Design a protein around this ligand. Sequence first.
Ligand code: PLP
Ligand code: PLP
Lengths: 402, 402
Amino acid sequence: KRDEALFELIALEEKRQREGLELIASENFVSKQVREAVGSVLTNKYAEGYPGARYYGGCEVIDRVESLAIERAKALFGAAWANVQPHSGSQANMAVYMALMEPGDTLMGMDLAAGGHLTHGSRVNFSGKLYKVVSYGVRPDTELIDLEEVRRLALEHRPKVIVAGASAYPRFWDFKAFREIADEVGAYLVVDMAHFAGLVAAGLHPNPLPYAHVVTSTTHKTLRGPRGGLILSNDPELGKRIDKLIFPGIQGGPLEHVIAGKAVAFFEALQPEFKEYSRLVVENAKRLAEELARRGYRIVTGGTDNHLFLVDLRPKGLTGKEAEERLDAVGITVNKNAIPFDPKPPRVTSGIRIGTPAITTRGFTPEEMPLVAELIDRALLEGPSEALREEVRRLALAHPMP
Amino acid sequence: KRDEALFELIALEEKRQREGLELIASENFVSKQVREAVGSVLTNKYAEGYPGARYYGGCEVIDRVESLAIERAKALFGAAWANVQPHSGSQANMAVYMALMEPGDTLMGMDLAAGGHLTHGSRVNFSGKLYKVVSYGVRPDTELIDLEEVRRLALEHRPKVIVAGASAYPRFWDFKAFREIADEVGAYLVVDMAHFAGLVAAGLHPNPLPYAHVVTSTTHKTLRGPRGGLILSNDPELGKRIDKLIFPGIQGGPLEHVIAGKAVAFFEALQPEFKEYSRLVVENAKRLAEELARRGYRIVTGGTDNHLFLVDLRPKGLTGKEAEERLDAVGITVNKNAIPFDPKPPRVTSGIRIGTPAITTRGFTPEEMPLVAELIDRALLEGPSEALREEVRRLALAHPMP
Ligand SMILES: *Cc1c(COP(=O)(O)O)cnc(C)c1O
Ligand SMILES: *Cc1c(COP(=O)(O)O)cnc(C)c1O
């Protein structure tokens, strides 16, 4: 018997995805073939260990699949070693931290409020629970990272690991500078490129591989792959240690169906078409930010170098919470985000974060950003209305999903 | 462009699965609908947080999907609370340990050599790295757990957490007694039912819910669901604490497509047909163990109460590794496994573990176990040969696949 109650919900979710504008920066829409791989029979195989060194018989084909994912990841990112088994970006970071540190050691990462991720040191996360944490943010006068301050903090706190990368930072990273700082204090530099991995793959964002000791990432987000994690490095010896932390360290059986999906995603990203997609993602973000600025909003840092940007809602007297609600009411999904030194508490905020990967995948182009900006502005100024919700629905439907 | 190379590999794995006898105790074959859910568009939604308490909007449908999985898990196992977000059985255990203990606390579990899982205290696993581990085993004469011995170990070491359940123990567990022991030292009793969860759901194995403080499990294995984890408890308040450890504690975004698959698997397990399936799983295991015993193989504990059993190959002059390889050579897949008081190192072992969940799903019946036993025996005695390989292939192909 078919589980009709569950499948009725999946149909509803498909409809929801088709009829709204997804502007959450960490979202995207995977291809039908990525889904085909993830929904494959590869889930039936227990394959603890690594290719050619498994703890179960019958892994001959799974080994070819995982090796393919590994080799493609190395070719795509110009890496010498890769681990494609992390179940998520969080597990990728967890394995790396445990391979480079012991509980009690000091971890340095970007403050959550400044754009850092929970796994970069939050007290409610394993990162802050297992390690002592020192955080860096952005300057009040520039809204950008202050390398001089990062260096000062590193020298004073002597972290064992320094993490570069974030979930809500709209500009490029100076990986060379971070590595120089790490070397000065004898710390490992870990770059978490989860958000901008697709841009790195497309050659549209500085490549952290040569500068970081280890690079972690999600396979979803700008890379547009299945939900999961990834680890890369130019140091195979260090890679061997990290492999041991993924298994038997923190995971058991890998999700080989998802690994097959990662291989497919890497195949897609290796095609010239992915660079064109990525160029449009960045152009769309830059243009949408400009169009919103022209309509009366302020953009944190004045713009963006990547796929996302932060809108300062203060010029129009709105809070991030209010903006998120009004937009949600008309079918546009964004998320509130604190602006630098936000005068409002975290549960309220004075801004919202917008990212273009998802709508770009659905066919939105730069010349359509003025319209998107207008719809966003109308929702925030007039508030929700049936007419606006339906205009958004029609626009979304006119841009079919993969 | 289609990733032909990757899909050709998936086709080869489908072929491998169709033409061999998969006897790995922890494997199974998921249904087409479980695969359909896992390969759904639900992977495109970031749902950090919990139903009705998400970080981002747009989870209206996702919440109903996760909630359906939660309520079905509760109904299936008679639990007051459930967390369906763990990415794997390992993450389920990791979250529970971190919710109940602080690094350095004493963790008591079953010795790996006696049947315990690596997450029950292995020195190279997070369990043994973060906590001080003490382990209980089985009696050398009966190869069964001695509750009095377990009680003495608990009183001596005063563990904060005692884990009952294992990945390679062929007999029933006295959960009531384990709870009494935990209570004697004020420890939390955690039951890891990953291997026998399906049997518990079918009412063919003692249910740990009333006695354990917390129950962890995989959704794959005897439960025959998608690859992932699960946590249950008879105490909703303790559940609230554990929810915080899964997120924001050790994970980020949950795999909602997999959670949809969990809902489907729970639906399937709630059907009367699942009880019949589970009955056949146990009957097949008992009969296959008997058939091998009649061929001179020594079965640990002399038989089994569940879906798996261990074969001590020392008398046959074969190591577990050699046996695993010989069988794999003719399409019969198993995994080497240590035997109680095994003299050989883990990398070699003196035995193999066999389980019937997978072949039972394909339609194998107790009356066919005499033939399976013959093929296993011949593979170990005569070694690989195209002739034997073909006989295995024929028997396998005589059974359809989910
Ligand atoms: C998204 C993200 C993660 C975590 O990934 P999950 O798959 O949600 O566990 C970690 N670090 C950064 C910088 C991220 O953007
Ligand atoms: C299978 C198993 C696990 C781990 O599950 P993974 O999904 O492989 O991480 C943990 N404990 C027990 C008893 C298991 O059988």
